[PDB]
Design an enzyme around this catalytic site. Structure first.
Site, PDB file in Angstrom:
ATOM      1  N   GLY A 286       0.837  -1.191   0.075  1.00  0.00           N
ATOM      2  CA  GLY A 286      -0.044  -0.005   0.174  1.00  0.00           C
ATOM      3  C   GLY A 286       0.698   1.162  -0.105  1.00  0.00           C
ATOM      4  O   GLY A 286       0.542   2.111  -0.775  1.00  0.00           O
ATOM      5  N   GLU A 289       7.299   3.573   4.571  1.00  0.00           N
ATOM      6  CA  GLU A 289       7.599   4.882   5.188  1.00  0.00           C
ATOM      7  C   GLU A 289       9.147   5.255   5.244  1.00  0.00           C
ATOM      8  O   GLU A 289       9.436   5.595   6.345  1.00  0.00           O
ATOM      9  CB  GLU A 289       7.012   4.457   6.631  1.00  0.00           C
ATOM     10  CG  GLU A 289       7.825   3.370   7.285  1.00  0.00           C
ATOM     11  CD  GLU A 289       6.964   1.938   6.953  1.00  0.00           C
ATOM     12  OE1 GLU A 289       5.855   2.111   6.518  1.00  0.00           O
ATOM     13  OE2 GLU A 289       7.553   1.031   7.719  1.00  0.00           O
ATOM     14  N   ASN A 290       9.551   5.220   4.071  1.00  0.00           N
ATOM     15  CA  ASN A 290      10.951   5.489   3.800  1.00  0.00           C
ATOM     16  C   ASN A 290      11.277   6.967   4.483  1.00  0.00           C
ATOM     17  O   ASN A 290      10.493   8.024   4.352  1.00  0.00           O
ATOM     18  CB  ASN A 290      11.508   5.508   2.584  1.00  0.00           C
ATOM     19  CG  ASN A 290      11.272   4.237   1.679  1.00  0.00           C
ATOM     20  OD1 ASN A 290      11.412   3.043   2.276  1.00  0.00           O
ATOM     21  ND2 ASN A 290      10.278   4.169   0.702  1.00  0.00           N
ATOM     22  N   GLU A 323       1.542   6.229   7.480  1.00  0.00           N
ATOM     23  CA  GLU A 323       2.883   6.568   7.036  1.00  0.00           C
ATOM     24  C   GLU A 323       3.585   7.451   7.784  1.00  0.00           C
ATOM     25  O   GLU A 323       4.854   7.489   8.326  1.00  0.00           O
ATOM     26  CB  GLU A 323       3.035   6.650   5.485  1.00  0.00           C
ATOM     27  CG  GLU A 323       2.436   5.502   4.688  1.00  0.00           C
ATOM     28  CD  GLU A 323       2.909   4.322   4.872  1.00  0.00           C
ATOM     29  OE1 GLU A 323       3.932   4.218   5.014  1.00  0.00           O
ATOM     30  OE2 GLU A 323       2.125   3.337   4.967  1.00  0.00           O
ATOM     31  N   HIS A 326       4.316   6.136  11.028  1.00  0.00           N
ATOM     32  CA  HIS A 326       5.778   5.359  11.063  1.00  0.00           C
ATOM     33  C   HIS A 326       6.800   6.131  11.285  1.00  0.00           C
ATOM     34  O   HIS A 326       7.787   5.637  11.463  1.00  0.00           O
ATOM     35  CB  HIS A 326       5.688   4.567   9.887  1.00  0.00           C
ATOM     36  CG  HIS A 326       5.218   3.210   9.783  1.00  0.00           C
ATOM     37  ND1 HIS A 326       4.081   2.765   9.358  1.00  0.00           N
ATOM     38  CD2 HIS A 326       5.707   1.951  10.614  1.00  0.00           C
ATOM     39  CE1 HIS A 326       3.725   1.428   9.661  1.00  0.00           C
ATOM     40  NE2 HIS A 326       4.838   1.016  10.504  1.00  0.00           N
ATOM     41  N   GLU A 345       4.372  -1.616  12.747  1.00  0.00           N
ATOM     42  CA  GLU A 345       3.124  -1.721  12.248  1.00  0.00           C
ATOM     43  C   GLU A 345       2.070  -1.506  13.138  1.00  0.00           C
ATOM     44  O   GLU A 345       1.131  -0.612  13.035  1.00  0.00           O
ATOM     45  CB  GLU A 345       2.967  -2.961  11.498  1.00  0.00           C
ATOM     46  CG  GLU A 345       4.114  -3.434  10.550  1.00  0.00           C
ATOM     47  CD  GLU A 345       4.651  -2.253   9.448  1.00  0.00           C
ATOM     48  OE1 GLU A 345       3.725  -1.542   8.760  1.00  0.00           O
ATOM     49  OE2 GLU A 345       5.977  -1.740   9.590  1.00  0.00           O
TER      50      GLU A 345
END
Ligand SMILES: *[C@@H]1O[C@H](CO)[C@@H](O[C@@H]2O[C@H](CO)[C@@H](O[C@@H]3O[C@H](CO)[C@@H](O)[C@H](O)[C@@H]3O)[C@H](O)[C@H]2NC(C)=O)[C@H](O)[C@H]1NC(C)=O
Ligand SMILES: *[C@@H]1O[C@H](CO)[C@@H](O[C@@H]2O[C@H](CO)[C@@H](O[C@@H]3O[C@H](CO)[C@@H](O)[C@H](O)[C@@H]3O)[C@H](O)[C@H]2NC(C)=O)[C@H](O)[C@H]1NC(C)=O
Ligand SMILES: *[C@@H]1O[C@H](CO)[C@@H](O[C@@H]2O[C@H](CO)[C@@H](O)[C@H](O)[C@H]2NC(C)=O)[C@H](O)[C@H]1NC(C)=O
Ligand SMILES: *[C@@H]1O[C@H](CO)[C@@H](O[C@@H]2O[C@H](CO)[C@@H](O)[C@H](O)[C@H]2NC(C)=O)[C@H](O)[C@H]1NC(C)=O
Ligand SMILES: *[C@@H]1O[C@H](CO)[C@@H](O[C@@H]2O[C@H](CO)[C@@H](O)[C@H](O)[C@H]2NC(C)=O)[C@H](O)[C@H]1NC(C)=O
Ligand code: NAG
Ligand code: NAG
Ligand code: NAG
Ligand code: NAG
Ligand code: NAG
Ligand code: NAG
EC number: 3.4.11.2
Lengths: 901, 901
Positions: A286, A289-290, A323, A326, A345
């Site tokens: 989906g 989260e870099n 995101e 995260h 998560e």
């Protein structure tokens, strides 16, 4: 084995400090029709223990032999490197093993230099490519997805979440394409001396971060930017056609406020100067989260007000919140090993709702958290072949095992456990403990013990009374699988707790140190008035808070805060049914959904008669709220799956046609003959649910309405008369009720689709056809990447096996072409698990069980990978189904007939 | 083995002369709820060779020990039989073995008396029971089916066709129930001394007749009688309701004249005083030719002018003619052994057309012999797993093999071979030889050599010129499998022949003494003018009769009289196609059907391109005759089977929708908007085909027409406005287009049906539903004898496998319950051969072939019985289908598209 390179776990001998990675992607196929990226890497590491070998992660990387070896070794600060004996590439463990002629010195620093090349494939893993069309020209975008174990694919590294290091990134790209990474570019881009057509962009040094949060993108995507209130510059990147149409306006609206809200809520400022949210045409998951470069699917980021529905808006805002959450739970503080994946998560999967609640305060998504998280995971947590929230690290080594952890268990059960923890700890104490935990372990790795310790410190500081310490309360919820069922004897007010299992005869093989006993916080209501909280510590307890006199009824788990199921005696069940028939508004909406779902799931586990579960839905004829209807439809999805190919599907549909005809009719008055949509989000969801339910079960009015709407759209292909919220379901029905011509029209529209939302709607609707040959042709289409993207392949197949006609087609296709499917598509991602679950979820017959057993036996050598446990679960579920229908078929049929009139 | 009782064939040591059989059926269940019959029988036999053991046939019989043994021996004419040592029953060979302490004397007569008990089950084999309902009263009828090896089930006997004897039949029946047998009663009935409520009817001694022709019927049926011209009383028997409504009037009209016509035609008078034709509610086959008591299925005898269709009328006249021809061929003269079964069934199938043409001169049924006999059998005769017309007697031992011989080969190929024989011998010489053959071998068994000898005598007497003796001409067709294909090179006039095989790879294991070389009588036409007859006695030959100059075209096999296929050069084929486009009437109708069928079968044999075969159907847009359309639809049935679950089905239907749309419209003008029917039978059949083809391939006006007709019938259940000829297609199409309501309405009419013809129409239609759960429910119904009779079980299941949705359903059902079907219906009323052929004819993939091989491997121990060879054929066909689809799918799909517009 005994050899170090034959173990999947990296030795703790060497610790990396800083990496220098230069990457040069080629977006034009070479003489072999192959997209190739060439790069150079320099990794500096400290030698914690004396060793004669160096083990680093390397996957599908061909090394250019320099100085007579694959790798070059140098010292730092006077340290001398021993001469390299040899280098070997171990495929099974994916490792570059450098054997030396001597031994390194303890507490010394060395640099390791490598030249490598790899394929810029379309596998959506590592450094891959995504293709799209602008007008009549192809465009290729090089992007990354290093989730789990893919950082080793891009360059040699110590690919473990605990091996944090600072990365210096350099991208050599074409002069006309922008390069994006985790940090802002350092200075301006300069032409490559070898070719002025190539640019060299060097980025700033990233902070201490894990190898799986890296991102290298080169593309001509354009962006809309805005400065957030906390000084962080938020940019939204997408295709020029998408940005020029303003599809990124909502994302820019919601991204900044959510980030600032999280920063203020947790008192931990965002440490990066910028944040770029970029939508990719091809993307496996989906979103990812870099740190500093968050990548999304185009459906989860872009939103078109004229063509996207409210569900798409909710999906976009929730994914953005997830995101951005995260960023704190997963990037600033990372897990020590994947076995504790629920720390990242799960945490996001909880606080995403908080973020959404800030962005859209009038939506009330925290209510939807009960159905989306708790009752979603409770279906698979009731299996004897489930796993605890925190699996021991010894059982989780291979990349495939690491990938399986990304299941409903981690996300949903972590979110539910944190929801219950904040419910019984109050939000203030919970967030204070979370802030202390975030400040303490910044740029470091954590386990569940640290979280429990910090929460205990917060509890002691705030003087909160709990039966035991936080660690002891939450070890019952983290260290063992499953959830407790709570039986209430209202005659004496006695509470009993026991491990809930869908199949009572299923053999639990995983021992628990607590013997499957939980310390359960219990919130109860009596006649709609809330009572004082209780703590079930022992297996059986007695209290007067749960004793009823006369017509009093008690309901446990108010608003479903705790992660447990509740069962009552027949007296209290009858009182609840009488209350529901008299005035169902006296029970909370979430509690009505809990009642329906709990009754159905207890009936499936043989604790209560199925007749009681069906009786609990008799009040739906006067129910207008979204949540009870959605819970009832989700519960009856099991009945639909169980009996769609039997004599029970006749009466059952009729029963639904009786229950949903009023609601449908009501909305016809509410929407003014389907020209308006309700203001409230819950009402819009309930309207769509009512249309779909009345329309699949055979209410003639919806069939005529959807046929008329689709023919009206077919007359005017450019102007769509269907409102977006009503689009998807109408499409599906219009393809089920129509014929070849409607399918061809929908396929042609899907090919020209410019918005990913409309394309997804049409792709899901095209599997609703009732023609066998059309389904076969569609299944043939799904494997062609030209027609249907690879990222959408398996999902499409799932839709095909959602159709009752296509179940056999998909099962035979899977049995025939598993060997091929395993090589590509799902493989070791998070999709195969879904395909196995979807194709084997209709099995109710001993013949089907033997077919599944033969399928498992025939594919032992090729393996199952990420689809292993799911397959196991399927087997268990199948057995349960065989024991269920044989026990419950006839009576169920009778009931439906008795209520079909 | 060496043991005599372990050998299936009876010994030649003992030969029966006469039997005395007394049978008493108990038409009510006993204390165990069982229908039983008690009997006593004596057998007089001569000892041809001195033996110490008496081996007789005994199946499912319980013997009461008399004088310490199962049977009692007595001497005849002063002979002294040795005392009984022991009596045993061996089930696998179904033998009662009586061991004697001594040996019988050669050329001596003895008598064996036995008292036995058997079960009057509902297996439709031997002495069985048939149940029906008069109002609310259950009526049970004791009837018989002794074809094959079921005569041992009723009474012990030397159950072989060669063991002819004279039978004295006595039936003990209730007071008010009539009894019928092969002969007239020997005086009036008398009350049973034991119980006055029972009557004892003794019948006259039957002539020398085979054991499998005996009939014993106890029923309260009513009859209509009429004396034929030859002084034979024809009595039609049926249920009181059927006779009261005059459903037996047509049978009375046709039976007598057909018998008289046969007697006059073959110069052999009927040797029995009366002929009874009785319709039974439960009957396995279409009819049975018992001498004097011909048993029929209700549908094969009863005909209601108001409700039955012309197709039903045609079946009645044909089946009656088939049995009346069996009277001369099969009763008067019997086969020596089942391996020569074509002497009975082939002759009967050929002469049934003569009888029906006499009874109905204007129908022209003889032409249908091409479609119903020749082209039906060629499909199974083009197989490597076929069997010759006259199989060696050593290969037919077990009863299962005997039942297997009752296949398309015997019936249809015998009909075609005798048709060719009459063609090149002329009807006069043919019938002279048949009359001589009948006269010589009256009351005697025969082989094919006797038939050839008498035909040769007739040829020599009439001075007919032939290339060789009749024996040598006809042994090619009789003793070796398959049929030849004659390739013609018209540029030079070269004729060549070869063994036609659908698969060039298919290996022919069975050897042929003639090396698959035939002496072929060839008839040709040039530009519509008949040429001289030719005889192809060699593999290759040259003649100017088959050489064309300019636009001249030549066709072979005029009116498909010969049993061979024809192939031409591309030039002649183009000339034929151009003719068909210009003026199709210049080619005979039977030859047009030949062109279409031969082209398609050659394309399936990889001898000509598929485009040619598809091109030969282009002229159908202006074709109104029944035979070309029927042949084309039959040929395209294979295409539909191959492609109904693939992308090719889309265009294919459209192409058919293009071809049949004019014809349909034409009939709308002919029938005056469907209130009338055409006068000619062939035109009526063509109208039904046009309606069915238009509705199946999605021609709208047909769909609204059938839907409106069925809805109008639904409004008024008593008044059915659908014409009987249109009822089957209207019912099936309406159920397909409709929903649950139509299926439920049809089911009620079926379970409340009074005429079998209407019930069959509804039973066939109910399987046309497109809903999966409805098909599952119907499939579950088919196994319940209360809802669907056992005799109709397999056929109904076959209908379900004809539905595209139900294919996987029936395949899974068979795979799961083969043992149950091969046990509960094992060796009974279940036609496993037809079921396997129907279920496995869609297999065209390697996965399906592997599934079929696994099905064979799983049930090796339980065996397949009479469906053995068909299974083999299926496997062969499956592999051939895989190759054909792989190479033709692409070209076929394109051809349809380029011709669908
Ligand atoms: C990636 O970038 C970081 C940051 O630039 C590199 O760390 C830096 O490495 C240089 C190497 O020369 C260090 O310079 C040294 O500074 C000390 C200061 O006392 C001086 O005595 C030495 O002579 C030398 O000039 C620098 O301090 C160090 N850190 C920073 C903040 O710049 C790192 O080496 C790079 N990693 C790679 C190339 O893999
Ligand atoms: C069996 O054969 C008999 C005689 O061949 C058939 O009876 C005949 O049936 C036709 C049709 O109903 C009768 O024609 C009708 O005659 C009346 C006058 O009697 C006339 O008003 C009608 O318009 C019609 O023309 C015919 O008279 C009648 N003949 C006899 C001698 O009864 C009988 O229908 C046949 N049974 C079948 C085919 O099932
Ligand atoms: C690739 O490199 C060229 C050369 O440096 C860049 O072109 C310059 O862009 C800057 C932007 O401020 C201009 O001021 C210069 O005049 C341009 N030319 C030169 C000769 O410097 C180009 O922008 C780069 N492309 C990127 C970054 O994608
Ligand atoms: C993003 O937010 C802006 C401002 O809140 C929205 O712009 C407003 O849109 C509404 C509805 O069209 C108008 O009535 C206002 O006048 C707009 N305000 C301004 C300042 O332009 C914008 O629609 C939002 N984008 C979304 C929700 O996609
Ligand atoms: C059973 O046999 C008896 C005796 O023969 C039959 O009874 C006679 O039936 C005839 C008509 O068939 C009458 O004329 C006699 O008066 C009857 N007499 C006696 C002694 O019963 C009886 O009909 C037979 N039942 C059958 C044939 O079903
Ligand atoms: C790496 O080498 C292998 C074996 O020579 C080859 O198959 C593969 O294509 C190479 N990788 C690239 C990116 O060319
Ligand atoms: C369900 O409701 C019916 C009345 O509609 C009642 O008779 C029955 O007992 C109920 N079943 C249960 C399990 O309470
Ligand atoms: C494809 O879809 C676009 C939608 O933007 C439309 O403008 C175009 O006419 C379509 N082309 C065809 C061939 O359908
Ligand atoms: C014959 O005997 C067997 C064995 O005793 C028994 O099972 C069967 O029912 C008997 N048949 C009849 C018709 O009595
Ligand atoms: C055929 O046989 C008949 C019967 O005897 C005889 O009259 C006739 O002459 C024969 N024909 C010949 C010998 O050609
Ligand atoms: C069939 O007809 C088409 C034109 O209608 C022609 O091109 C093709 O060659 C024909 N097929 C053969 C085998 O001649």
């Amino acid at each position: 084995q005994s050899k170090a390179w034959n173990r999947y776990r990296l030795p703790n001998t060497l610790k990396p400090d800083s990496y220098r990675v230069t990457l040069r992607p080629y977006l034009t196929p070479n003489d072999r029709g192959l997209y190739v990226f060439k790069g150079s890497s320099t990794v500096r590491f400290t030698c914690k223990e004396a060793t004669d070998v160096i083990i680093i992660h390397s996957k599908k990387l061909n090394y250019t032999l320099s100085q007579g070896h694959r790798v070059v070794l140098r010292g730092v600060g006077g340290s001398q490197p021993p001469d390299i004996d040899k280098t070997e590439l171990v495929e099974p463990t994916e490792y570059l093993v450098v054997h030396l002629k001597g031994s390194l010195v303890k507490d010394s620093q060395y640099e390791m230099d490598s030249e490598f090349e790899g394929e810029l494939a379309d596998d959506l893993a590592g450094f891959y490519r995504s293709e799209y069309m602008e007008g009549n020209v192809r465009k290729v975008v090089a992007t990354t997805q290093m989730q789990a174990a893919d950082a080793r694919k891009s360059f040699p590294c110590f690919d473990e979440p605990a091996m944090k290091a600072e990365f210096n990134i350099t991208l050599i790209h074409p002069k006309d394409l922008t390069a994006l990474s985790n940090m802002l570019p350092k200075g301006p881009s300069t032409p490559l001396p070898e070719d002025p057509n190539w640019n060299v962009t060097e980025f700033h040094t990233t902070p201490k971060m894990s190898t799986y949060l890296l991102a290298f993108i080169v593309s001509e995507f354009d962006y809309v930017e805005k400065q957030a209130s906390n000084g962080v510059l938020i940019r939204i990147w997408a295709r020029p056609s998408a940005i020029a149409a303003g599809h990124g306006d909502y994302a820019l609206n919601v991204t900044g406020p959510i980030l600032n809200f999280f920063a203020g809520h947790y008192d931990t400022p965002y440490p990066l100067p910028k944040s770029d949210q970029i939508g990719l045409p091809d993307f496996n998951a989906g979103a990812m989260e870099n740190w500093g470069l968050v990548t999304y699917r185009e459906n989860s980021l872009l939103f078109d007000p004229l063509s996207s529905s409210s569900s798409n808006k909710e999906r976009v805002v929730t994914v953005i919140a997830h995101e951005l959450a995260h960023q704190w739970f997963g990037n600033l503080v990372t897990i020590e090993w994947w076995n504790d994946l629920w720390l990242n998560e799960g945490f996001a999967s909880y606080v995403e709702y908080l973020g959404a609640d800030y962005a859209e305060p009038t939506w009330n998504l925290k209510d939807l958290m009960v159905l989306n998280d708790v009752y979603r995971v409770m279906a698979v947590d009731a299996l004897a072949s489930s796993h605890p929230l925190s699996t021991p690290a010894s059982e989780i080594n291979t990349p495939a095992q690491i990938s399986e952890l990304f299941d409903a268990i981690s996300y949903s059960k972590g979110a539910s456990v944190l929801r219950m923890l904040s419910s019984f700890l109050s939000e203030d104490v919970f967030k204070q403990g979370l802030a202390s935990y975030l400040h303490t372990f910044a740029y470091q790795n954590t386990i569940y013990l640290n979280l429990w310790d910090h929460l205990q410190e917060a509890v002691n500081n705030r003087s909160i009374q709990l039966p035991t310490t936080v660690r002891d309360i939450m070890n019952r919820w983290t260290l063992q699988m499953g959830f407790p069922v709570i039986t209430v004897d209202t005659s004496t007010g006695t509470l009993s707790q026991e491990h809930f299992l869908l199949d009572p005869d299923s053999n639990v093989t995983r021992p628990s140190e607590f013997n499957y006993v939980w310390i359960v916080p219990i919130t109860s209501i009596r006649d709609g008035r809330q009572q004082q909280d209780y703590w079930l510590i022992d297996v059986r307890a007695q209290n007067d808070l749960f004793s009823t006199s006369g017509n009093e009824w008690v309901l446990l788990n108010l608003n479903v805060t705790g992660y447990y199921r509740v069962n009552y005696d027949e007296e209290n069940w009858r009182k609840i049914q009488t209350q529901l028939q008299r005035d169902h508004s006296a029970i909370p909406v979430i509690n009505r959904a809990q009642i329906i779902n709990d009754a159905f799931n207890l009936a499936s586990a043989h604790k209560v008669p199925v007749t009681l579960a069906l009786n609990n839905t008799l009040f739906l004829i006067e129910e207008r709220q979204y949540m009870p209807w959605e819970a009832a439809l989700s519960s009856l999805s099991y009945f639909k799956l169980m009996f769609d190919r039997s004599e029970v599907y006749g009466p059952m549909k009729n029963y639904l046609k009786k229950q949903v005809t009023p609601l449908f009719i009501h909305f016809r008055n509410n929407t003014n003959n389907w020209r308006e949509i309700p203001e409230n989000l819950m009402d819009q969801y309930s309207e769509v649910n009512a249309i779909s339910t009345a329309c699949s079960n055979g209410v003639p009015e919806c069939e005529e309405m959807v046929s008329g709407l689709f023919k009206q759209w077919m007359e005017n292909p450019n102007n769509n008369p269907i409102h977006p919220n009503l689009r998807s379901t109408v499409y599906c029905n219009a393809i089920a009720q129509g014929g070849e011509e409607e399918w061809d029209f929908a396929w042609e529209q899907f090919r020209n689709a410019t918005l990913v939302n409309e394309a997804d709607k049409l792709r899901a609707a095209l599997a609703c056809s009732k023609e066998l040959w059309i389904l076969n042709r569609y299944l043939s289409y799904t494997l062609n990447p030209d027609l249907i993207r690879k990222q959408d392949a398996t999902s499409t197949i799932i839709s095909i096996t959602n159709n009752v006609i296509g179940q056999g087609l998909v099962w035979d296709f899977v049995q025939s072409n598993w060997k091929k499917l395993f090589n590509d598509y799902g493989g070791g991602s998070f999709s195969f698990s879904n395909l196995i679950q979807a194709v084997t979820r209709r099995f109710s017959t001993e013949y089907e069980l033997q077919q599944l057993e033969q399928f498992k036996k025939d594919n032992e050598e090729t393996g199952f990978g990420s689809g292993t446990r799911a397959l196991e679960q399927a087997l268990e579920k199948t057995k349960a189904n065989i024991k269920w229908v044989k026990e419950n078929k006839e009576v169920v049929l009778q009931w439906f007939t008795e209520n079909s009139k």
